[PDB]
Chain A
């Protein structure tokens, strides 16, 4: 659900990094 999340809500790097180390 990450695509719709980011496309509506700006992904901060702190959160975005949590998806992939």
Chain B
């Protein structure tokens, strides 16, 4: 795991990867 500033989407993506499911629930349908 690289200790980084993680801005924007990268933060919620890394947090989802480490927690493993049941966090963040959104997908676009545009």
Contact = CB atoms under 8 A, between A and B. Distances in A.
Interface residues of A, number: 15
Contacts of B1: 13
A3 B11 CA distance: 7
Contact of B15 (A7, A8, A9, A16): A16
A3 B7 contact: yes
Interface in A1-21: 2-3, 6-13, 16-17, 19-21
Contact of A17 (B3, B6, B11, B18): B18
Interface of B: 1, 3-8, 11, 14-15, 18-19, 23
Interface of A: 2-3, 6-13, 16-17, 19-21
